[PDB]
Design a protein around this ligand. Structure first.
Ligand SMILES: NC(=O)C1=CN([C@@H]2O[C@H](COP(=O)(O)OP(=O)(O)OC[C@H]3O[C@@H](n4cnc5c(N)ncnc54)[C@H](OP(=O)(O)O)[C@@H]3O)[C@@H](O)[C@H]2O)C=CC1
Length: 294
């Protein structure tokens, strides 16, 4: 049996990825940071007749040394890893829940309008981004992906067909990278390295902390998130180059109705996960280094 690790597996797209991989005969290690939430998710899938799922704790921001226990667990019970889905991620902003629920109620969750207004200024007024949230966003969406990937690479090396799928967003496209220095680094594909991508991340965090978002031409809203995904894409390309044995790709699942969006989206969680699972289960002869649907 092929086996998979999915990060952020307790809810949203991640939970549905675990369910669908399991449905396709994959042995799934559902990981997430909250132990109670993890056990409840696995119990829920079992009660749905998905038996090839097991829980293991994983907060992607923890030290890489702590992750050694996941690596050992997989080696001991499975002998290899075939699939890693880097799904865990956060938006980098909070919302006024009361007013957001009022806005959703008012419009009606349907009529493309709800999705339309979610992107209007009327909506941003209900959202708050802070340096604290930015720092966490980058640690989870970018650095966390690097740590989990580094720890599990030696197990993926043992697979005859290793795959890494990183869940990205189209807002991470270079078209939205406004800062000139960042655009220059991320757009110079031939010169991409992990170190240069780290520079972009550190540049953003430094400017954010020093209140230079507007001043240095960063996006006026959602700069942490969009930067984290643009850096995730670049890192995905670098990793693809470094490890030609692997399939390493990003997938942008479209706008999905999860708690990340307070239920707003074009696709259900099931549908979003389907988009990611189609790449995770590519034939053994598959491409690497690309950004699907981004
Ligand atoms: N929903 C959308 O429209 C889109 C989502 N994406 C990407 O899809 C991925 C999943 O998003 P989605 O399902 O919508 O969001 P959800 O908020 O519903 O789920 C997020 C998952 O990530 C977990 N998570 C958050 N921080 C950490 C951490 N430090 N360590 C381990 N797990 C963590 C959450 O755990 P917990 O329950 O403990 O908080 C949860 O399991 C993300 O990378 C997101 O950026 C890309 C394009 C569109």
């Amino acid at each position: 049996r092929r086996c998979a690790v999915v990060t952020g597996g307790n809810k949203g797209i991640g939970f549905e990825i675990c369910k669908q991989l399991s449905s396709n005969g994959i042995m799934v290690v559902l990981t997430c940071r909250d132990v109670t939430k993890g056990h409840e998710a696995v119990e829920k899938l079992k009660n749905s007749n998905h038996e090839n799922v097991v829980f293991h704790q994983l907060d992607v921001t923890d030290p890489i040394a702590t992750m050694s226990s996941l690596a050992d667990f997989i080696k001991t019970h499975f002998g290899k890893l075939d699939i890693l889905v880097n799904n865990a991620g956060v938006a980098g902003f909070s919302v006024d829940a009361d007013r957001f629920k009022a806005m959703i109620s008012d419009i009606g969750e349907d009529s493309e309008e709800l999705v339309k207004i979610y992107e209007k200024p009327e909506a941003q007024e209900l959202m708050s981004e802070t340096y604290e949230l930015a720092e966490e966003c980058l640690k989870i969406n970018y650095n966390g992906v690097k740590s989990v990937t580094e720890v599990l690479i030696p197990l993926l090396q043992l697979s005859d067909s290793p795959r890494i799928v990183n869940v990205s967003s189209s807002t991470g496209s270079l078209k939205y990278v406004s800062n000139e220095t960042a655009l220059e680094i991320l757009g110079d594909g031939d010169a991409l390295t992990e170190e240069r991508i780290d520079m972009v991340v550190n540049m953003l965090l430094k400017d954010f902390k020093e209140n230079l978002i507007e001043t240095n031409g960063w996006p006026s809203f959602g700069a942490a998130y969009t930067t984290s995904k643009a850096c995730l894409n670049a890192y995905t390309r670098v990793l693809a180059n470094k490890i030609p044995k692997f399939q390493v790709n990003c997938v942008c699942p479209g706008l999905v109705k999860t708690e990340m969006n307070y239920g707003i989206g074009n696709y259900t969680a099931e549908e979003g996960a389907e988009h990611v699972v189609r790449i995770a289960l590519f034939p053994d002869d598959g491409p690497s280094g690309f950004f699907y649907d981004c």
